[PDB]
Amino acid sequence: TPAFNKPKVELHVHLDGAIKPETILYFGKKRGIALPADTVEELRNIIGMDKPLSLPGFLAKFDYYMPVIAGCREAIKRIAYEFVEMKAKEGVVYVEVRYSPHLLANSKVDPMPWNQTEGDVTPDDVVDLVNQGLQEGEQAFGIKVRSILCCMRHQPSWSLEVLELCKKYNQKTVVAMDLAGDETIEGSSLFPGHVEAYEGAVKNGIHRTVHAGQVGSPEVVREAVDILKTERVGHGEHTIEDEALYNRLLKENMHFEVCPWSSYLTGAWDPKTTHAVVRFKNDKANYSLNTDDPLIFKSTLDTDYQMTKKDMGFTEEEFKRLNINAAKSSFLPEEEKKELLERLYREYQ
Numbered sequence: 578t579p580a581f582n583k584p585k586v587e588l589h590v591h592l593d594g595a596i597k598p599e600t601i602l603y604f605g606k607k608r609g610i611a612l613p614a615d616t617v618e619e620l621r622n623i624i625g626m627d628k629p630l631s632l633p634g635f636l637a638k639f640d641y642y643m644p645v646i647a648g649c650r651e652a653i654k655r656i657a658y659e660f661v662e663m664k665a666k667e668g669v670v671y672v673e674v675r676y677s678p679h680l681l682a683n684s685k686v687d688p689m690p691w692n693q694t695e696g697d698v699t700p701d702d703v704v705d706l707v708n709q710g711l712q713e714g715e716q717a718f719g720i721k722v723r724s725i726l727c728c729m730r731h732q733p734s735w736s737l738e739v740l741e742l743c744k745k746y747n748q749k750t751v752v753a754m755d756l757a758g759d760e761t762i763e764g765s766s767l768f769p770g771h772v773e774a775y776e777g778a779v780k781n782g783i784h785r786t787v788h789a790g791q792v793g794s795p796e797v798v799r800e801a802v803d804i805l806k807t808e809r810v811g812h813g814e815h816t817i818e819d820e821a822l823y824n825r826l827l828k829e830n831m832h833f834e835v836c837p838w839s840s841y842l843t844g845a846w847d848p849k850t851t852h853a854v855v856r857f858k859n860d861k862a863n864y865s866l867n868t869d870d871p872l873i874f875k876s877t878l879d880t881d882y883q884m885t886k887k888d889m890g891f892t893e894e895e896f897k898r899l900n901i902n903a904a905k906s907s908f909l910p911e912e913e914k915k916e917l918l919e920r921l922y923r924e925y926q
């Protein structure tokens with residue numbers, strides 16, 4: 578029985594962490610690019626994980642399959658279309674999906690990701706391709722889907738271009754910029770490309786989210802908020818380690834994009850402490866529940882909703898509350914945000 582069988586909102590899910598294994602196999606074969614396995618089941622076992630790794634050890638899983646998607650236009654549109662297909666099945670009415678356009682390009686991107694041969698797919702092309710597959714997905718399945726473009730921590734030289742792509746594709750479908758990748762890279766929040774991207778975003782009214790406090794110190798969160806000027810924090814669990822900062826963000830009504838299942842598997846949460854999400858619920862924080870990389874974690878949104886119901890006693894009422902909070906914190910323009918809120922209340926009566 579599904580933990581919560583009513584419309585849900587999802588803010589934090591990576592397109593390139595949410596690809597069908599069957600579709601990765603399909604493209605490895607069509608293109609003749611290697612894969613670490615040859616049937617769907619063995620691919621799941623290898624790419625997927627059921628025991629905690631460190632964050633760099635988790636991020637390496639992408640290496641297995643990205644090469645089979647990157648630089649292939651049919652593949653990029655197709656994963657975006659099937660993304661909407663999946664989320665529609667899970668009873669999501671609105672979802673913001675994030676990716677790095679540079680990590681899927683094979684032209685005008687330096688350093689060339691994945692040791693690719695120069696092709697014709699620029700980062701600008703990737704966005705348009707993903708827009709296309711999402712819009713087709715919307716027309717087919719009738720849920721609302723927007724996109725978030727990721728700066729990557731290790732590559733601040735892409736960040737100004739990420740910001741320009743957010744400006745160019747604003748609300749079609751790109752609603753925000755994000756900062757993702759290896760949180761453990763010393764001082765990465767302050768690399769000049771990242772700081773200046775986020776400054777340009779403030780100055781041009783481009784929405785902002787930042788992965789912080791997944792494995793880092795509370796200081797990485799404080800940097801997301803006070804220097805980068807984020808409006809939402811991805812994860813944020815390790816914020817509680819700093820009491821004054823947690824309380825400031827509570828008072829200022831910061832949104833935390835919690836990914837509970839993600840949390841165990843990246844070793845961000847110790848299974849024999851209280852998940853920070855329990856504290857968020859008792860404090861009536863502003864947070865959402867998110868699958869983060871469902872392909873790698875072998876999960877669906879119900880996975881995270883089951884985890885919190887079974888292991889943390891989340892009620893139907895708390896589920897409705899945090900989705901209402903997720904809607905309020907979405908990056909939709911005002912009239913679409915009101916429309917979403919109207920729908921959630923109607924459906925929750």
Ligand SMILES: O=c1[nH]cnc2c([C@@H]3O[C@H](CO)[C@@H](O)[C@H]3O)c[nH]c12
Nearest residue numbers: 591593675676677727757758788870
């Ligand atoms: O758990 C995570 N923490 C930090 N970054 C990532 C991404 C990174 O964002 C890029 C675009 O989605 C992915 O390619 C991955 O490197 C995936 N999952 C996580």
Ligand SMILES: [Zn+2]
Nearest residue numbers: 591788811869
């Ligand atoms: Zn993430």
